[PDB]
Amino acid sequence: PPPPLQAVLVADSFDRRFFPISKDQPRVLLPLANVALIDYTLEFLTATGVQETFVFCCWKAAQIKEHLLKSKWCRPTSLNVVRIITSELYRSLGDVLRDVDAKALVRSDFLLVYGDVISNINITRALEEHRLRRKLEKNVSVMTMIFKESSPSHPTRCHEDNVVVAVDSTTNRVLHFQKTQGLRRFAFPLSLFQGSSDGVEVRYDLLDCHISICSPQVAQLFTDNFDYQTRDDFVRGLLVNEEILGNQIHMHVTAKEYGARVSNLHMYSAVCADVIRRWVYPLTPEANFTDSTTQSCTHSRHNIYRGPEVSLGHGSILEENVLLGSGTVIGSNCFITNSVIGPGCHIGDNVVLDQTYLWQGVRVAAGAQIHQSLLCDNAEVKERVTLKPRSVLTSQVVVGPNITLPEGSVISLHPPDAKGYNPAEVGAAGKGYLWKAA
Amino acid sequence: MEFQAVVMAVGGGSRMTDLTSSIPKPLLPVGNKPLIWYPLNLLERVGFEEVIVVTTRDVQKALCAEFKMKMKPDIVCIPDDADMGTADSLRYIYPKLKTDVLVLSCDLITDVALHEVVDLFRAYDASLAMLMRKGQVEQRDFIGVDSTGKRLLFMANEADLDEELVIKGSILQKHPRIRFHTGLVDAHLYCLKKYIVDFLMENGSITSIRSELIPYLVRKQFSSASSQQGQEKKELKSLDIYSFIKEASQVRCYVHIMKEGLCSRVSTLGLYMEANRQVPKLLSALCPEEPPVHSSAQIVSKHLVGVDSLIGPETQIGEKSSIKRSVIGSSCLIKDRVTITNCLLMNSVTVEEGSNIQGSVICNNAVIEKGADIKDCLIGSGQRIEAKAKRVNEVIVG
Amino acid sequence: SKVSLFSHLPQYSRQNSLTQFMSIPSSVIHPAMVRLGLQYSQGLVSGSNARCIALLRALQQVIQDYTTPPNEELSRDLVNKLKPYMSFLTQCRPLSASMHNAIKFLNKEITSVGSSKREEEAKSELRAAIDRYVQEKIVLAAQAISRFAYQKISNGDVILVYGCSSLVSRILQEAWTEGRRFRVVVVDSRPWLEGRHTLRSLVHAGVPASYLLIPAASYVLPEVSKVLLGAHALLANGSVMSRVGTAQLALVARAHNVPVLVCCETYKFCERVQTDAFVSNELDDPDDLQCKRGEHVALANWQNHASLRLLNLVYDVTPPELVDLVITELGMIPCSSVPVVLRV
Amino acid sequence: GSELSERIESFVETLKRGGGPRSSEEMARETLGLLRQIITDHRWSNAGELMELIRREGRRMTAAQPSETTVGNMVRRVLKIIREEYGRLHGNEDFSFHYAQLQSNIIEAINELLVELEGTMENIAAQALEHIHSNEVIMTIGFSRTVEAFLKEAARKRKFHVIVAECAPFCQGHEMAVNLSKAGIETTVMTDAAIFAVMSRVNKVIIGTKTILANGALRAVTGTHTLALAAKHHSTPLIVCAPMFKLSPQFPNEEDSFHKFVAPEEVLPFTEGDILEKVSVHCPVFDYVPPELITLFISNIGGNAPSYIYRLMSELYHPDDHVL
């Protein structure tokens, strides 16, 4: 049998699409459904039989280290060994690949994953297919991409991630791979059709999961070419250069499992909604796979989850798909639906919450109406406040009474570029700034 | 009262150089029978009782009422001095058309039942349903079908394409996956309805249906008020077909293909010998009362015969005339010690003794000489033959 | 390989095409009806509503092209000519009570025609009569039924539906448009899975809805308040014939104390009598029961095993003791009062 | 120590992430083996330490997966055996006096329990000849090994006919249909919806179960409840075949943990993404059945009425250990 399976984890985004918020907290530590965004990936890796893992982190690595040292995966009874490597010279995926090739860590086929992936996919069959393919031939296939079958109208298909792919019908082999952003027409070179006989299959109904099975050879190809910095560049360079090079890239498509990656607010909302509705069955809020003594739930009718020691007033109504932390206090005659509430929050009376997410330590005054908003750690709202859809409030910000923000408002504690507080912007006795635009 | 069959045979092609002109195109010799008898018999096999065929005056003279088949042919004399096309000819016969039409060409030979394609036309009220056979350079065409492989979705030819093909970003949002085919051979079995000819009555730009009608139709069958109207004219496009069709996304196209069987059109000289070699197998079940050698043929060498050795009437044979799966026509004189392999012969061919022919063709009024070592040719008409020579690539000019 | 219990009922497959055995230029049977019979084996089936409309349209088209025999009249010639036609249609697929009533009405109309009028006058009169029949017996009846049933829906209700039926969807959409608020629950069953039509229509309309399968029916009945059902026929004794599974829903709803309402038109009233949900049914293709397990598809080559039968029923009968209200174009009546009122 | 902890962690992790191709008998055997192993090692002073440790481990393993009930039954049975042994050895309940023959007696008692457990299905199958007669029709739903053995034992003498419901959406009835067809018995497969239509021609109904509660109620597969009602509409007897380790000292008070819910993938596929944002799907697995719909209980002892069940409970578990 081959050596035990190994995994590489990238815990740095190298992006700026989450940067009114990531000033304080790194992306991998964001709370989704009251659970950090790094536990899901580690549990997914553990469930598939991975016996060793490497972790790379550069930005604010101290918090990541202190969080990982208290998790259950560092206990001596864990079957998966966690190793931490940190540096301040990393800038892209290519640098990480060069470093791992230089240090000579991997010895056989391994996995490569980002830091924010939610899935429950088993790998054994794809691994066996890859091993058979690389055994019958010699160093022909050096990659095996993973995709999920889906329709082009699902709400989990952002415009920034749609792709179109051309494959051979008989053996799954990627012949073309293009990203579609602002393009109303798709073009393909004519050399593909004449090479083959009875299949140039074109697909637009696949969802990417950013999961790969890589041989050590890939590392070498990331060292010879010093201009490569992402997976897309590697794929395009391999597909274009066809003298000898790496020979082929193959694909595998699943149909009865789940897999997704969070990269923006739209993806965050879609993934949270899918997780609440038990679309990833083994990982559910009441399962408590983190075995933390401060997180427990009791499933009820209409998909309602309640934690320990939660007080409820008279006349309150919970519609469906609600999560409540520990110690939360609710007033009287409220209306909460499709919402997530973190631990330790206080809510007044006559409040309406719809498709909203509130994190820990947030206090809300009575008589308010909120729709489709995100509130960060330790926020507060005064009386007579109405937030229109698509609103964001970062940590420690306050909003004064008798105000009504328009759609798309963004408020952060830091200055707009990082002065007094405008009573027209943040209300009376408000502490914050209006960032404006995205 | 529901289907009108229209048989087209006017003009040959580049590959033909001495057959479609000297011999009538419908009456070219394959299996000692005229070729047009093959599709026409099929029309009489299903039960069709009305056949309309257009042709020239010479073919009409060569035809008259010489056959003894039950159908009553209705021959219309096309003007011979013309460069006519499919659209123009169907424009001519329009006043005689009332119901749906079925266009067929004499050059086609197939053994597949037409019940399947007519069923497809009936059930899904499709505008048309053409036929393609699996391929067995000329700017190869690419056709893209859907997942179920029944509905045509894309079609293009390499002639106007330079280096790449472009697909509009609206087809995929309705049909997520499509499959491409490149090696295919078309068949002239266009089962279009009455509205198409009415639409093309007022439009004269279209001249050939194969290269002009189907591309525009398949292009327009997809787009709608968006794309073909939002991104891109009743008074300019001569009352476009969309305005025409007003009855109880109205134009839909479907295509059927098959993988096993025989279906080909004899428009190339290369396929001629494959045709005349494989037609006895069809004739064995098609006409089980046709002996391989004609009854009134003067046979002498009855033991040196290979496979079937088709022989026409009044054909005198010589002893020791070895034959291997060859074709022989009428009134042919054969002497002794003549060996023939996989060769073709037809009416009024004289052969001298001591000959040897291999994989050749012989035309009318050809006199074979003694000691003729023939290796592949076609042989001209009204010319004598000398010894040796003849080649497949270096075919005799005469 | 039928079950001995259902030996009498015939079993048919969807791959025994009957069109191969006659000429492409059809002369025995009119081509439009040949197309209709071909389409009968693919779709165009919805509660005997679309089927009856298509049959009447084809009959109108056939009547359009007729020639009076020199030594005969229309009354006998047309009647004698029509028999092989719907005989072949029955050979394609079994009919329904609505089509029987329609053809009976058409024959009655044909017989009463006198010989004084011309052929064209008779043809126009027959077309007008058919148009009057279809206009009066279907559309206005549906409008009246919707108007009557609008009064039995209130704010905050939870209504349960089963299968696919145009009448129920029309009623619900009209009630929602009129300005009432409620929510719906849809129950589906293998292998047809016809509830997805209703689910999609309701979602597009803008009505909250939930979806589930039949075996969990007892799980959600504590929340429901009403049960609304369609029908395919109405027997003389007052029973209701519908798709298989309706009687189970009626029984469990009765056990949970929930009222049941049935909607139907007055031209589906049959004269047959049945005492059990058995005997007079129709079998279907057993190969549809094969589960697409993906890997290790069981029941594959089920004919190989010695003793193994697959059963596939289409209909069932509900006794009148499990129904509390019936709404027709003439009003609302108790179930047991159906035969006395409608017989006239 | 390390081996015991590794085994415990492996068992808990296997329990949490669903499971595998395991029957009830295998689960009981594994639980008993693990309990015997923990008794052997992990030296204790007196009975109190042993009881506390066993109770803690049982609470952990029970909270690992609520829907699995055999583990708790085995834990309570072991506790009762320990209580009986301590009472016998000893002459104000106190468990501090020290002895030396306790562990040997406990071990041999557990061995006798295992020996009794091994020979269970044969005893149940041995009674098949007193209920099934020639020319009869039997109804069943799902896939249960005990029912399969019960039918196969009686198939060697008489001939009858069996009807099986497919029990969607998992559709495990096909496996039993195939297995019974291979043995040479007439079989028929049909969907769930036709249960009420064919009930009028059935002589008996025989089923299995997942759990048995104190008052005689049942926790079975989804489609059982309706199947129980229709039979009551015709006074057709209903029979349950189950061994004795499926009995629990619980009552149907709270149903929040009664049913088990899974992903909605089984009901509605993911390829309907246009409308999946506004539709909620629910997929229960288990189902509750009241005791008024059951006629007879068959086990490795004999036939009993639903009222007798209570008595069995009082002689199987001590009242103290009802709540771990």
Swiss-Prot record, chain A:
Free-text description of this protein's post-translational modifications in UniProt: Phosphorylated on serine and threonine residues by GSK3B; phosphorylation inhibits its function.
Top-rank taxon, per record: Eukaryota
Localization in the cell: Cytoplasm, Cytosol
Record comment: activity regulation: Activated by the chemical integrated stress response (ISR) inhibitor ISRIB which stimulates guanine nucleotide exchange factor activity for both phosphorylated and unphosphorylated eIF2.
Gene Ontology molecular functions: guanyl-nucleotide exchange factor activity; translation initiation factor activity; translation initiation factor binding
Cellular component, GO annotation: cytoplasm; cytosol; eukaryotic translation initiation factor 2B complex; nucleus
Modified residues (Phosphothreonine): 284
Phosphoserine: modified positions: 92, 412
Disorder named in the UniProt entry: Leukoencephalopathy with vanishing white matter 5: An autosomal recessive brain disease characterized by neurological features including progressive cerebellar ataxia, spasticity, and cognitive deficits. Brain imaging shows abnormal white matter that vanishes over time and is replaced by cerebrospinal fluid. Disease severity ranges from fatal infantile forms to adult forms without neurological deterioration. The disease is progressive with, in most individuals, additional episodes of rapid deterioration following febrile infections or minor head trauma.
Family: Belongs to the eIF-2B gamma/epsilon subunits family.
Protein name: Translation initiation factor eIF2B subunit epsilon
Included stretch of the parent chain: 39 to 500 of 721
From Swiss-Prot, chain B:
Recorded GO CC terms: cytoplasm; cytosol; eukaryotic translation initiation factor 2B complex; guanyl-nucleotide exchange factor complex
Record carries keyword Acetylation: yes
Activity regulation information from UniProt: Activated by the chemical integrated stress response (ISR) inhibitor ISRIB which stimulates guanine nucleotide exchange factor activity for both phosphorylated and unphosphorylated eIF2.
Listed GO MF terms: guanyl-nucleotide exchange factor activity; translation initiation factor activity
Modification sites for Phosphoserine: 238
Role: Acts as a component of the translation initiation factor 2B (eIF2B) complex, which catalyzes the exchange of GDP for GTP on the eukaryotic initiation factor 2 (eIF2) complex gamma subunit. Its guanine nucleotide exchange factor activity is repressed when bound to eIF2 complex phosphorylated on the alpha subunit, thereby limiting the amount of methionyl-initiator methionine tRNA available to the ribosome and consequently global translation is repressed.
Keywords tagged on the record: Acetylation, Cytoplasm, Disease variant, Initiation factor, Leukodystrophy, Phosphoprotein, Protein biosynthesis
Protein name: Translation initiation factor eIF2B subunit gamma
Source organism of this protein record: Homo sapiens
Subcellular location(s) per record: Cytoplasm, Cytosol
Curated annotation (Swiss-Prot), chain C:
Main subcellular location: cytoplasm
Cellular location(s): Cytoplasm, Cytosol
Example of a GO biological process term: T cell receptor signaling pathway
Record text on activity regulation: Activated by the chemical integrated stress response (ISR) inhibitor ISRIB which stimulates guanine nucleotide exchange factor activity for both phosphorylated and unphosphorylated eIF2.
Keyword set, alphabetical order: Acetylation, Cytoplasm, Disease variant, Initiation factor, Leukodystrophy, Phosphoprotein, Protein biosynthesis
GO cellular component: cytoplasm; cytosol; eukaryotic translation initiation factor 2B complex
Gene Ontology MF: a single term: translation initiation factor activity
Record's keyword annotation contains Nucleotide-binding: no
Function: Acts as a component of the translation initiation factor 2B (eIF2B) complex, which catalyzes the exchange of GDP for GTP on eukaryotic initiation factor 2 (eIF2) gamma subunit. Its guanine nucleotide exchange factor activity is repressed when bound to eIF2 complex phosphorylated on the alpha subunit, thereby limiting the amount of methionyl-initiator methionine tRNA available to the ribosome and consequently global translation is repressed.
Similarity annotation: Belongs to the eIF-2B alpha/beta/delta subunits family.
Protein name per Swiss-Prot or TrEMBL: Translation initiation factor eIF2B subunit delta
Swiss-Prot record, chain D:
Gene Ontology MF: a single term: ATP binding
Leader sequence segment: none
Biological process (GO), any one: response to glucose
Regulation: Activated by the chemical integrated stress response (ISR) inhibitor ISRIB which stimulates guanine nucleotide exchange factor activity for both phosphorylated and unphosphorylated eIF2.
UniProt KW Cytoplasm keyword: yes
Source organism, top-level taxon: Eukaryota
Assembly mode: Component of the translation initiation factor 2B (eIF2B) complex which is a heterodecamer of two sets of five different subunits: alpha, beta, gamma, delta and epsilon. Subunits alpha, beta and delta comprise a regulatory subcomplex and subunits epsilon and gamma comprise a catalytic subcomplex. Within the complex, the hexameric regulatory complex resides at the center, with the two heterodimeric catalytic subcomplexes bound on opposite sides.
Descriptive protein name: Translation initiation factor eIF2B subunit beta
Species this protein is from: Homo sapiens (Human)
